[PDB]
Amino acid sequence: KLQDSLDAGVGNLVDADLAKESAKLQSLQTKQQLGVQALSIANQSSSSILSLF
Amino acid sequence: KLQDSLDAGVGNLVDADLAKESAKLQSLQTKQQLGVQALSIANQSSSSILSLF
Amino acid sequence: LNSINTNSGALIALQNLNSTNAELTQVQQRINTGKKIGSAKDNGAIWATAKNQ
Amino acid sequence: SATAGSMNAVKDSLQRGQSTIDVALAAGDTITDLLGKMKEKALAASDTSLNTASFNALKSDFDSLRDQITKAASNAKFNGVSIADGTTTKLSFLANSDGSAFTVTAKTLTLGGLGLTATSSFTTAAAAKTMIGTIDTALQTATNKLASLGTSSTGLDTHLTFVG
Amino acid sequence: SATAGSMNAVKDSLQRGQSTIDVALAAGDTITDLLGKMKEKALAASDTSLNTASFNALKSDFDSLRDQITKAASNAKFNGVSIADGTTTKLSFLANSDGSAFTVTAKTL
Amino acid sequence: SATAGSMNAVKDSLQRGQSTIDVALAAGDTITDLLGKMKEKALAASDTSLNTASF
């Protein structure tokens, strides 16, 4: 019983809660796509002044 | 439960509403191209009096 | 402003995208090992305590 | 512009230090597993009910893991430089363009850094009973050293982001 | 025309102050994450039920984070001047062509 | 436009009140379960046939 309690304590110490990691993965992939699009919009800025010349 | 409530409060405090940001990005890109065209029309003005001489 | 030699907005957007990619790497490690403290880099005290336990 | 272009060497030094600590952490994982199996062997040897043959096989497995810790500590190097082999007291890494160092104290993982010696073993049940606590202290100091290297690696990562 | 052409130095001073405050804000973000981890370590060490080894490990990580705060505060400079290093009480910046200051009080970190 | 931009603080205070009421509802659920256990304990103790130790 004591060895089972020690293994349970190690699992309480280090194990992660995957149910939150799933929603975190969804939100972070969506945020990556949005950040890539924002980075491309930042890349586009230089071209606008070529029309002035 | 208190930890989840505090995280929800931080999200209420600082998170943005992206659905407004999409329409704002569309209208502001259109306004930026229109501003570049108006600035070019402002650049043109000096040329008209060269024909007077 | 209106520079062609530098683009600070692309630098800030790349910083934000790098932070998002780091968060995705963290979530990917927590998913593929199942531990929120899978190494000493995550948290040395709790990791050493779990190792001794 | 020159000071801004000088930061690439600093980022390279921080990445090199992170790689060295990564190799040292892998060797430390191996050494901790070997220390745990050695505590298993010593605790099994401590019992007085065993016949001589089981005690001899246990001391032989204990000597085998003790040699494995030596070689595993010997192989912990990254491009000929190490933070865990015990060759040097510390490693300094670039922290800014002016040349300020980021000190990283070395943490020896060889048997001599664990308080053990190459000849160390046991031949009687009382010697195994003392070796139980000896391996306890050795595994404890090894985990403390590994935690220190992990904190140093997290500091290298944060300073790299700040330099960028 | 001279008063109009002198404004570029004022604009340069304001951009210089903005860059210095940006570097200080990055160092402050790092210092805040370090302070939060030290809160977690001290709050974990406060529990009576821990054995001596966990308390010693929490003390070691706390000391390491305390040294990291010193380094992150030391490195917060923009070309040799800093608003957060604590080497000066305040930085002044141009506000107009006549030389009026735009005072920015230092915030030691 | 100033009055239209003024509403963000109102929405923030509204959300803060919602969060405070949520924490209060969690504490009330806990207090309700505790009150039910205490009612069961008192109702069990009310019987006279019980011996002193169980009381």
D85 secondary structure, DSSP code? S
Residue C37 sits at the chain A interface (C-beta within 8 Å): yes
Please write down the HEC assignment for all residues of C3-37. CCCCCHHHHHHHHHHHHHHHHHHHHHHHHHHCECC
In whole angstroms, give the CA distance from residue A15 to residue C29: 12
Q: A39, C17 in Cβ contact below 8 A?
A: yes
Q: F residues 24-43 near B, CB within 8 Å?
A: 26
Give CA–CA dist F12/D35, Å, rounded.
Answer: 56
In this structure, the number of other CB atoms found within 10 A of the CB of residue A8 comes to 10
Residue of A28, D14, D144 whose CA lies nearest to C30: A28
Angle at C35 between CA C34 and CA C39, to 5 degrees: 135
Q: Do A48 and B33 touch (CB under 8 A)?
A: yes
- The secondary structure of residue F50, as a DSSP letter, is S
SS3 of residue D103 by DSSP:
strand
CA–CA distance, D86 with D70 (Å, rounded to integer) = 12
What are the structure tokens assigned to D30, written together? 């191996």
Cα separation, D86 vs D109, whole angstroms: 7
Are D29 and C40 in contact by the 8 Å Cβ rule? The answer is no
What amino acid occupies position E4?
A
Distance CA D161, CA E64 (A): 18
Per the entry, the structure determination technique was cryo-EM
Distance CA D158, CA E36 (A): 15
- Å from E71 to nearest chain D CA? 9
To the nearest whole Å, the CA of B29 is away from the closest chain A CA by: 10
**DSSP secondary structure letters along A7-45:** HHHHHHHHB--HHHHHHHHHHHHHHHHHHHHHHHHHHGG
- For residues D139 and D35, the answer to whether their CB atoms sit within 8 Å is yes
Task: Give the bridge partners for D78, in sequence order.
Answer: D81
d(CA A26, CA A40): 22
* Residue E52 to residue E66: CA distance in whole angstroms: 21
Return d(Cα D34, Cα D61) in angstroms, integer.
11
Helices (H), B1-53: 2-14, 18-43
Q: Which two tokens mark A16?
A: 């992660």
- Quote the tokens at residue A42: 């930042």
Residue type, D130: T
CB B2 to CB F12 under 8 A?
Answer: no
- The DSSP symbol for D104 reads E
| C-alpha–C-alpha distance, residues D55 and D51, integer Å | 7
- Identify whether the C-beta of residue D82 lies closer than 8 Å to the C-beta of residue D20: yes
CA dist E97 and E1 (Å) reads 12
| A34, A41, A52: residue with CB nearest B39 | A52
- Which residues, 6 or more positions from C15, have their beta carbon under 8 angstroms from its beta carbon? D164
Most B-contacting residue of F23, F29, F31, F33 (CB-CB within 10 A), to test interface: F23
Residue C17, exposed/middle/buried by CB under 10 A (0-12, 13-18, 19+)?
middle
In the block, tokens 């009310």 appear at F46
- Distance (Å, whole) CA E11 – CA A53: 26
Between helix A18-43 and helix C8-33 the angle, nearest 10°, is 160
Burial class (CB in 10 A: 0-12, 13-18, 19+), F31: exposed
Ramachandran angles phi, psi of D120, nearest 5°: -60, 135
Which has the closest alpha carbon to A10: E50, F12, C52, F4?
A: C52
Round to whole Å and give the CA distance between E30 and D80: 33
E-assigned strand segments in chain E? 90-91, 104-105
Q: Which of E33, E68, E77 to mutate to test the interface with D (most CBs of D within 10 A)?
A: E68
Angstrom distance (rounded) from CA E97 to CA B25 = 37
For residues D9 and D130, the answer to whether their CB atoms sit within 8 Å is no
Q: H or E element: which one contains F44? A: helix F7-45
Nearest residue to A23 (alpha-carbon basis) of C30, D146, E75, E106: C30
Largest CA distance in chain E: 76
Residues of D within 8 A of C15 (CB-CB) are: 164
Residues of chain C with Cβ-Cβ distance to A17 below 8 Å are 36
Q: Do F19 and B8 touch (CB under 8 A)?
A: yes
Go through chain B and tell me how many residues it has. 53
Q: Which among D112, D141, D102 has a CA at the least distance from the CA of D20?
A: D102
For residues D91 and D81, is the Cβ–Cβ distance under 8 A? yes
CB contact under 8 A, C17 and A15: no
**Residue ranges in chain D assigned as alpha helix (H):** 2-5, 7-46, 52-74, 125-163
E104-105 and D101-105: which strand pairing?
unpaired
How many helices (H) and strands (E) in chain E? 3, 2
CA–CA dist D64, F37 (Å, integer):
60
* Angle, CA of C51, C46 and E38, to the nearest 5°: 155
- Phi/psi for D82 (5° steps) reads -145, 150
Distance CA C29, CA C41 (A): 13
Q: How far is CA B11 from CA A34, B17, E44, F12, in A?
A: 18, 11, 26, 11
Distance from chain centroid for Cα C35: 15
Task: Determine the Cα–Cα distance for residues E20 and E46; give it in Å rounded to an integer.
Answer: 39
Q: Does B40 touch chain A (CB under 8 A)?
A: yes
Residue E100's identity, in one-letter code, is S
Say if CB D93 and CB D101 are below 8 A apart. yes
Largest CA distance in chain F: 76
∠ CA D75-D90-D96, rounded to 5°: 115
Q: How many CA atoms lie less than 13 Å away from B19 in the CB half-sphere?
A: 0
3-state secondary structure of D100: coil
Smallest Cα–Cα separation from D143: which of A41, F24, A53, C39? C39
